[PDB]
Amino acid sequence: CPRFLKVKNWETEVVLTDTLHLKSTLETGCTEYICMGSIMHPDVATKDQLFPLAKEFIDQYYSSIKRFGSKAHMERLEEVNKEIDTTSTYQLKDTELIYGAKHAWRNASRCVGRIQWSKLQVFDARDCTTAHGMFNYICNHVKYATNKGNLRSAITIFPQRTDGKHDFRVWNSQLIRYAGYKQPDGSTLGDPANVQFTEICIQQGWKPPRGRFDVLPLLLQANGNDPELFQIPPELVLEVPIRHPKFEWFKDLGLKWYGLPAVSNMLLEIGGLEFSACPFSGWYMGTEIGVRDYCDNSRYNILEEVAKKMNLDMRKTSSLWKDQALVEINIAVLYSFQSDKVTIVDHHSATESFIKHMENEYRCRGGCPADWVWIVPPMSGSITPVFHQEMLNYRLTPSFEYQPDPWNTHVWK
Amino acid sequence: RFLKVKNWETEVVLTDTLHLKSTLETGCTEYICMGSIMHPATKDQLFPLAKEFIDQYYSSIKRFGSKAHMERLEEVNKEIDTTSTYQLKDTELIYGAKHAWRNASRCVGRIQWSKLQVFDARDCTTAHGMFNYICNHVKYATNKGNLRSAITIFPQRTDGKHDFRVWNSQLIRYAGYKQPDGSTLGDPANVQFTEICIQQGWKPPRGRFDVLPLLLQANGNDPELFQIPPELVLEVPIRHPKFEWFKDLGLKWYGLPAVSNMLLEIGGLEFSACPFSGWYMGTEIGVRDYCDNSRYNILEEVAKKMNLDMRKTSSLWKDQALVEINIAVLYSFQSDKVTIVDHHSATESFIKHMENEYRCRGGCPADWVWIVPPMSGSITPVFHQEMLNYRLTPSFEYQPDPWNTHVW
Ligand code: HEM
Numbered sequence: 057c058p059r060f061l062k063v064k065n066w067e068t069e070v071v072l073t074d075t076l077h078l079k080s081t082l083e084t085g086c087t088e089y090i091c092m093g094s095i096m097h098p099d100v101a102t103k104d105q106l107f108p109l110a111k112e113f114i115d116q117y118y119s120s121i122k123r124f125g126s127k128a129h130m131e132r133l134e135e136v137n138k139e140i141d142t143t144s145t146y147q148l149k150d151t152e153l154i155y156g157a158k159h160a161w162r163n164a165s166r167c168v169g170r171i172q173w174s175k176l177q178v179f180d181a182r183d184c185t186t187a188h189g190m191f192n193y194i195c196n197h198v199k200y201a202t203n204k205g206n207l208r209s210a211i212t213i214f215p216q217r218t219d220g221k222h223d224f225r226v227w228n229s230q231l232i233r234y235a236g237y238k239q240p241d242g243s244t245l246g247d248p249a250n251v252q253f254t255e256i257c258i259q260q261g262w263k264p265p266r267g268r269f270d271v272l273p274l275l276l277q278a279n280g281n282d283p284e285l286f287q288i289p290p291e292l293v294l295e296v297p298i299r300h301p302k303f304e305w306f307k308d309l310g311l312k313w314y315g316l317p318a319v320s321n322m323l324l325e326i327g328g329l330e331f332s333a334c335p336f337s338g339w340y341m342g343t344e345i346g347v348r349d350y351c352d353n354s355r356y357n358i359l360e361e362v363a364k365k366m367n368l369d370m371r372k373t374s375s376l377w378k379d380q381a382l383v384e385i386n387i388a389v390l391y392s393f394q395s396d397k398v399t400i401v402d403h404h405s406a407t408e409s410f411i412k413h414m415e416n417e418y419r420c421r422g423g424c425p426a427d428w429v430w431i432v433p434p435m436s437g438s439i440t441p442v443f444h445q446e447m448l449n450y451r452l453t454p455s456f457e458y459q460p461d462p463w464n465t466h467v468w469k
Numbered sequence: 470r471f472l473k474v475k476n477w478e479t480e481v482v483l484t485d486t487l488h489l490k491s492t493l494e495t496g497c498t499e500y501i502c503m504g505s506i507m508h509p510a511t512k513d514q515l516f517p518l519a520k521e522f523i524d525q526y527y528s529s530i531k532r533f534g535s536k537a538h539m540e541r542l543e544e545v546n547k548e549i550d551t552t553s554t555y556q557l558k559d560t561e562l563i564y565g566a567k568h569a570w571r572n573a574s575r576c577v578g579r580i581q582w583s584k585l586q587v588f589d590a591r592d593c594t595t596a597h598g599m600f601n602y603i604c605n606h607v608k609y610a611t612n613k614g615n616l617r618s619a620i621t622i623f624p625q626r627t628d629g630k631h632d633f634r635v636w637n638s639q640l641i642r643y644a645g646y647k648q649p650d651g652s653t654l655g656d657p658a659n660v661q662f663t664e665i666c667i668q669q670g671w672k673p674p675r676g677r678f679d680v681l682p683l684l685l686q687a688n689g690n691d692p693e694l695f696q697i698p699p700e701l702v703l704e705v706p707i708r709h710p711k712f713e714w715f716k717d718l719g720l721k722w723y724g725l726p727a728v729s730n731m732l733l734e735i736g737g738l739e740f741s742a743c744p745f746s747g748w749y750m751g752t753e754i755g756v757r758d759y760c761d762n763s764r765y766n767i768l769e770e771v772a773k774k775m776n777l778d779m780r781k782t783s784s785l786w787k788d789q790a791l792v793e794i795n796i797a798v799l800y801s802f803q804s805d806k807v808t809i810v811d812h813h814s815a816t817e818s819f820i821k822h823m824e825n826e827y828r829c830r831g832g833c834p835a836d837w838v839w840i841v842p843p844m845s846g847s848i849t850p851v852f853h854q855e856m857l858n859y860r861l862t863p864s865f866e867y868q869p870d871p872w873n874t875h876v877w
Pocket residue numbers: 161164166167168169170172176209210211336337338339340341344401406430456
């Protein structure tokens with residue numbers, strides 16, 4: 057690996073120099089002969105595996121607080137070592153936990169929202185023992201993060217993995233999502249993405265309202281036990297009815313969405329420690345709802361209905377009727393959130409902020425790992441500045457990682 | 470190993486074995502992906518490259534290991550020994566040119582790969598000869614609007630001091646002019662090339678869409694200027710099917726996209742002048758050419774005529790204007806019966822092409838970053854298609870601009 061790797065912006069001619077890649081920890085999946093940049097996804101640490109992972113993290117932490125090589129640094133190293141030696145694991149200090157969580161976000165190459173990384177409220181839920189306790193922590197998280205529409209980024213962190221048979225897990229993929237129901241005739245009601253999870257909830261005892269926008273219950277697993285169902289207090293779930301500034305008929309589509317995007321199925325890795333339940337939330341970029349949630353064929357798939365209402369010629373693709381409807385839908389989403397004073401960011405503002413963030417990171421940190429395939433928005437790509445920005449992708453730790461869905465691995469008791 | 474790629478929308482999974490054949494580098498390493506970086510002989514080097522290519526040729530016509538196959542290898546070997554290079558057969562030239570297109574990871578139009586008219590120009594010696602070959606190419610490929618894919622191949626590189634080069638980046642392009650007030654008239658992408666033409670004696674009309682002259686270099690000599698006969702240059706006035714004011718913008722574009730600055734590599738041989746052409750995907754013009762900030766940059770003017778609220782970004786005024794411009798481009802070419810493909814139709818065809826290639830070839834190298842259209846990405850099927858990118862030869866490669874190398 058070369059000491060200096062350069063990236064260029066082809067629109068501004070700005071050249072940046074990356075050295076941070078030398079701190080790359082894990083493999084990307086690519087090789088000299090193949091690139092897997094468009095691949096979506098390309099038993100515990102032993103004592104001997106855990107020692108150097110912990111030291112690497114503690115070193116990084118003490119370097120960050122300008123106490124590298126200090127007596128406190130060396131004493132922390134020794135304490136962590138003795139703890140691994142005598143218990144096969146260790147506990148993070150609160151300061152370290154907070155630092156680790158912020159940096160997993162700072163390191164998330166797929167996240168366009170990272171200019172905000174240092175403003176993250178960290179809830180330490182490592183004292184939690186039961187699903188009811190998990191429910192309590194999650195409600196408080198939702199309430200704090202929602203903040204009556206003035207959304208605040210936050211993460212709640214449950215106890216780390218021990219032997220792998222006592223995992224805490226949130227079975228939901230996000231804390232707030234809508235049910236999907238497969239009909240006998242093959243049609244789907246609600247969100248098709250969530251059919252499998254919905255079916256699991258029903259089997260566990262959930263009585264479904266069988267509507268188009270039914271907020272799913274929480275399915276929560278503590279200490280490796282069977283998961284338990286809970287209903288999120290509806291007053292904690294902020295939603296926005298979707299309407300359009302010009303088209304009065306748009307509201308008649310009956311669309312709405314929830315305000316808080318809160319991903320709950322990822323694993324947080326800090327210093328070799330694994331936090332299998334670490335739900336975190338920010339605020340939406342409009343295209344996540346307007347393009348993906350609403351217009352993906354495998355989701356709500358509303359393009360045709362909207363186009364019809366718009367009286368477009370839908371006979372030839374070259375009329376660009378889909379593209380035309382897509383913009384109006386995204387206009388409606390942004391307008392509806394802003395009107396209800398619920399935090400949201402459009403794709404232009406978000407990508408422009410990210411470019412500034414990336415340049416700042418290159419200058420203060422020596423780089424900023426970024427996944428172009430994910431950073432570039434799903435509409436109007438080249439009229440956003442990120443399209444023209446060369447990026448380097450690599451994996452730094454602390455990190456957020458994918459993990460298998462818990463129903464595929466759980467040992468039912 | 471066998472690698473799998475999945476389409477997350479259709480759930481179709483394909484298995485790639487073809488990547489096992491690649492020997493050129495991608496630019497990535499195990500620790501760093503460079504997927505979004507734009508640009509990441511001797512007798513001893515030459516023969517194994519030649520052999521590799523002759524082998525796949527003879528395999529392709531199902532005569533691998535035949536007497537003819539063996540004879541060709543010996544013929545090539547002797548030829549490299551006695552001349553330090555070799556010459557391809559016409560059949561090989563055609564096979565190699567089609568496969569370079571077939572292997573072009575970044576090209577969404579590859580479903581057409583085997584329909585390519587190959588013009589052998591290896592007997593060319595002067596810039597006048599190059600001009601002639603290029604006029605014939607343009608006339609054939611244009612075909613009164615019924616565009617036909619073609620490539621014209623000029624003599625291969627020898628010592629590197631006698632390169633044939635087309636200095637233009639495309640055969641047909643519009644000039645760009647720096648203005649006293651610091652602004653730019655015409656295409657800003659071509660300001661530097663335009664200046665060179667002017668210095669070499671071209672008399673500029675100084676308009677917004679002046680077709681550039683050809684600047685052609687033969688056998689390493691200084692390049693010479695030629696004017697493409699205007700009757701050979703097919704153009705399309707851009708209008709909109711609903712907005713009658715759109716024509717008043719005075720926009721036009723040329724029908725024939727003919728990239729002339731790449732290098733074609735076949736069997737270790739290097740063809741530094743190999744202009745090739747197909748037909749346009751609408752977004753190439755309507756999104757990139759017209760709406761890139763560093764290009765014609767017309768979003769603002771259009772959004773004005775649409776009387777959009779351009780005060781906040783979240784009104785999506787840029788996105789709205791962008792769609793209308795691309796509607797206009799497609800409508801204009803179609804009305805004038807000039808071949809063009811929209812990004813929906815094109816990406817659909819590419820998905821079908823991929824299926825074909827996995828079935829008959831064991832894979833298809835594809836660069837998602839380039840294949841996904843610059844607008845409406847996720848409502849096209851390629852956005853949801855996992856791709857594997859790897860480099861196969863014969864190939865088209867980038868090369869430096871000749872004005873950064875040429876001694877006059
Ligand atoms: C504050 C406002 C934020 C915005 C606007 C934002 C924006 C985004 C967007 C648009 C994506 C792509 C989503 C998709 O297509 O599925 C994404 C991905 C991601 N975000 Fe952020 N985000 C924000 C906050 C956060 C926070 C607080 C965290 C963690 C503490 C985070 C971590 C991640 C990670 C790990 C991914 C990649 C997930 C994956 O690979 O599936 N983001 N972000």
